Amino acid sequence: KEYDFQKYTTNFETIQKGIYFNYDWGEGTTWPWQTFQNLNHDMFSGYFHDFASKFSDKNTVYALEAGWTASAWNYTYNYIFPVAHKSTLITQDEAKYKHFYGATLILKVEAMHRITDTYGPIVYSKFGKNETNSVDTQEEAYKAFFDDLDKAVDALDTYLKEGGKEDGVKSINMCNCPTASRWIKFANSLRLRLAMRVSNVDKTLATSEAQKALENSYGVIESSDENIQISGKGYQNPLAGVAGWGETYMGATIASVLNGYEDPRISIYYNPATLAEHTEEYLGVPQGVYAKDGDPNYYQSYSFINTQTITASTPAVLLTAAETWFLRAEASLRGINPKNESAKQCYEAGVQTSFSQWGAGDASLYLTSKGKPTDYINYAAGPGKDMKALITTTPNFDDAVNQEEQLEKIITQKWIACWPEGMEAWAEQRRTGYPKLFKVQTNNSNGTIDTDIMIRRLPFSQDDAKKDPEQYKNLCTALGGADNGGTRLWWDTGKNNF
Ligand code: NA
Numbered sequence: 001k002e003y004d005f006q007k008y009t010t011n012f013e014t015i016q017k018g019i020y021f022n023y024d025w026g027e028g029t030t031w032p033w034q035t036f037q038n039l040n041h042d043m044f045s046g047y048f049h050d051f052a053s054k055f056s057d058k059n060t061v062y063a064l065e066a067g068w069t070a071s072a073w074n075y076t077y078n079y080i081f082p083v084a085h086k087s088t089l090i091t092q093d094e095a096k097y098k099h100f101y102g103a104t105l106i107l108k109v110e111a112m113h114r115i116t117d118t119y120g121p122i123v124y125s126k127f128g129k130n131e132t133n134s135v136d137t138q139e140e141a142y143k144a145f146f147d148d149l150d151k152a153v154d155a156l157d158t159y160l161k162e163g164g165k166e167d168g169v170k171s172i173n174m175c176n177c178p179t180a181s182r183w184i185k186f187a188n189s190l191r192l193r194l195a196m197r198v199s200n201v202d203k204t205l206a207t208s209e210a211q212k213a214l215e216n217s218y219g220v221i222e223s224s225d226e227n228i229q230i231s232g233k234g235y236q237n238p239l240a241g242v243a244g245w246g247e248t249y250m251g252a253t254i255a256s257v258l259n260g261y262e263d264p265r266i267s268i269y270y271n272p273a274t275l276a277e278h279t280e281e282y283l284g285v286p287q288g289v290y291a292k293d294g295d296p297n298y299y300q301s302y303s304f305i306n307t308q309t310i311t312a313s314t315p316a317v318l319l320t321a322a323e324t325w326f327l328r329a330e331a332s333l334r335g336i337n338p339k340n341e342s343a344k345q346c347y348e349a350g351v352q353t354s355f356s357q358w359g360a361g362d363a364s365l366y367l368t369s370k371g372k373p374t375d376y377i378n379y380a381a382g383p384g385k386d387m388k389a390l391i392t393t394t395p396n397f398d399d400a401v402n403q404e405e406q407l408e409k410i411i412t413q414k415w416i417a418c419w420p421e422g423m424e425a426w427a428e429q430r431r432t433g434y435p436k437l438f439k440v441q442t443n444n445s446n447g448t449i450d451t452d453i454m455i456r457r458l459p460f461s462q463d464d465a466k467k468d469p470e471q472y473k474n475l476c477t478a479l480g481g482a483d484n485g486g487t488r489l490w491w492d493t494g495k496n497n498f
Pocket of ligand 1 (some may be wrong): 452
């Protein structure tokens with residue numbers, strides 16, 4: 001039992017700690033995650049912003065910092081993916097570990113879809129195969145993800161049909177999947193996410209994968225008690241770590257939305273500003289206000305994250321029941337939900353589910369409301385400007401003038417519900433155009449990123465390019481455009497196609 005424990009279980013610990021990355025390879029925690037995600041996706045999503053003016057001449061104004069943007073790639077390929085691959089190799093042919101094989105595959109897709117959604121082309125289907133060209137196009141990576149999820153759900157279903165105990169996954173549960181069936185439900189929900197991601201570029205694939213996701217007999221996540229979220233084995237939530245450094249402020253777009261909707265999640269997510277004369281208001285930091293080291297930290301008294309809500313021991317949310325309902329709402333809106341359920345029913349279930357996750361009460365009154373997001377007013381000192389609210393849609397689903405506005409409601413509410421996880425939020429914003437994030441006030445991208453289109457991706461890792469110039473060339477070829485922040489990823493068509 002102990003030889004097998006060291007053989008299999010430790011790999012699962014590294015992988016699960018390495019998704020919302022806070023894996024300690026020997027040099028500490030928190031600080032890697034800060035560049036992995038917090039100074040990229042979490043800001044670009046509109047959720048969060050730092051206060052330090054020393055950073056305000058970098059990512060916030062689209063002058064992308066090479067060391068920061070490479071981090072998701074570097075940390076994942078250095079420490080996490082090779083372990084997921086090893087775990088695949090040692091379980092795929094093991095008669096008694098079909099469940100661990102299934103779980104490995106699901107975690108591998110969970111980790112790596114976040115990387116392709118950041119950069120585009122990645123190394124995935126050809127990893128460890130020593131082929132001439134190691135690179136998957138994003139389309140090829142997505143197809144490999146769907147294939148891996150098929151293999152996973154097959155393996156776990158076989159494990160159960162052969163008489164494997166539901167709780168045989170107990171020793172590897174750091175993601176709130178205590179049974180084999182719950183891993184399959186995780187896979188089904190993740191497949192639905194990926195299906196909606198590809199719905200604008202490849203409706204045929206989206207349709208077939210959504211059908212598989214929503215007809216699989218093990219179900220999808222419907223209750224917040226089953227949310228996929230990381231905890232255990234000494235894992236600490238790195239968002240709480242960065243909050244402890246004083247660096248996680250509310251973003252202007254989420255302040256606009258939550259204030260205008262009079263959203264009861266507002267005080268759960270954030271605290272009121274400490275700025276004099278504004279101490280009962282929620283104030284969000286506008287992205288792209290230029291400043292540099294030596295300047296005052298103009299936004300230091302804006303609203304901060306709620307550190308009773310987000311603590312070191314708080315599980316790190318990855319995939320929620322609420323999100324799953326909003327995915328079903330979109331599938332219904334697109335006519336590709338095999339279940340007999342409407343977009344409205346799913347939308348309202350998503351909002352109610354999100355309220356319940358956070359303890360915000362019942363959503364019935366909110367779902368009838370006519371609140372509109374509020375304008376951004378620059379109360380801070382410095383060169384910031386006021387901005388008129390770009391989002392005009394209400395929480396009431398019936399107040400849509402067309403189905404594009406219905407999709408906007410679904411995605412905007414999904415964005416509230418995915419908080420604080422900036423990667424899913426940012427990916428969906430790029431994919432759908434929603435929510436309508438405030439644009440950067442200053443764009444120092446040297447023409448590589450368009451203010452109105454907004455940032456589309458992160459550039460490839462130059463640390464990897466220096467190790468492997470041929471691979472960098474291959475990644476660039478697979479991207480089909482310039483390696484900068486303005487090139488659309490494969491799933492980003494620039495419009496919603498029904
Ligand atoms: Na334009």
